[PDB]
């Protein structure tokens, strides 16, 4: 539960003119970055990279270089009904819909992964929709070798 500190080794800031909009994470062996978040990621050898991909899932996936295979996190694919965590608190997974406390997310906190317990990345936060006291997430998880994005009713992209 102290192992949220290792996200800084597998995250990068992406800026459009000088201001940070989102984050390009580094799950597994592929740079993932949400397709809406624009700019140039703050890393030279990760900049010159042809990786423009699909937009039905809203991702933009890459292939990481060989000298940065060991700076990556650990991916997994199973999730039980439990208690997961990311940088701005602690979440839970009930019925296929991650929920956070209202106000812990701000417009500009996309690309944040979600760890389970062992520092294993499960999904990618990219949205949110205010139900009231709680708010649920729009999120891009993968069941098994097939990413499927989830979107509740009336979200907006952070």
């Amino acid at each position: 539960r102290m192992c949220m500190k290792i996200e800084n080794d597998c995250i990068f800031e992406v800026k459009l003119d000088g201001k940070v909009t989102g984050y390009a994470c580094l799950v597994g062996d592929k740079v993932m970055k949400p397709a809406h978040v624009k700019g140039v990621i703050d890393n030279p050898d990760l900049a010159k990279l042809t990786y423009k991909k699909s937009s039905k899932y809203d991702l933009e996936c890459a292939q990481i270089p060989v000298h940065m295979k060991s700076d990556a996190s650990k991916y997994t694919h199973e999730k039980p009904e439990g208690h997961y965590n990311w940088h701005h608190g602690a979440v839970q997974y009930s019925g296929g819909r991650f929920t956070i406390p209202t106000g812990a997310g701000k417009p500009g906190d996309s690309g944040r992964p979600i760890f389970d317990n062992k520092g294993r990345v499960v999904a990618i936060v990219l949205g949110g929709a205010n139900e009231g006291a709680r708010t649920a997430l729009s999120v891009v998880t993968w069941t098994k070798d097939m990413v499927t994005r989830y979107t509740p009713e009336g979200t907006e992209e952070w």
């Binding site: 592929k30 991909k53 996936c61 991916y75 993968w142 070798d145 990413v147 499927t148």
Partner: protein, 52 residues
């Protein structure tokens, strides 16, 4: 010559609609860190010959 041009604007369209259907059917398999389901290796000519 117009019939000699209505072929090439009707043989590229049926080749354009295979490259689109090749793309849309296996685009999530390239995004995840995962395999290719080798039945679709046989039917669709997939770019993972076995890599990525």
């Amino acid at each position: 010559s117009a019939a000699g041009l209505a072929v090439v604007l009707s043989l590229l369209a049926s080749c354009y609609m295979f490259a689109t259907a090749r793309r849309k059917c296996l685009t999530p398999y390239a995004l995840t860190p995962g395999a290719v389901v080798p039945v679709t290796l046989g039917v669709l000519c997939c770019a993972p010959r076995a890599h990525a």
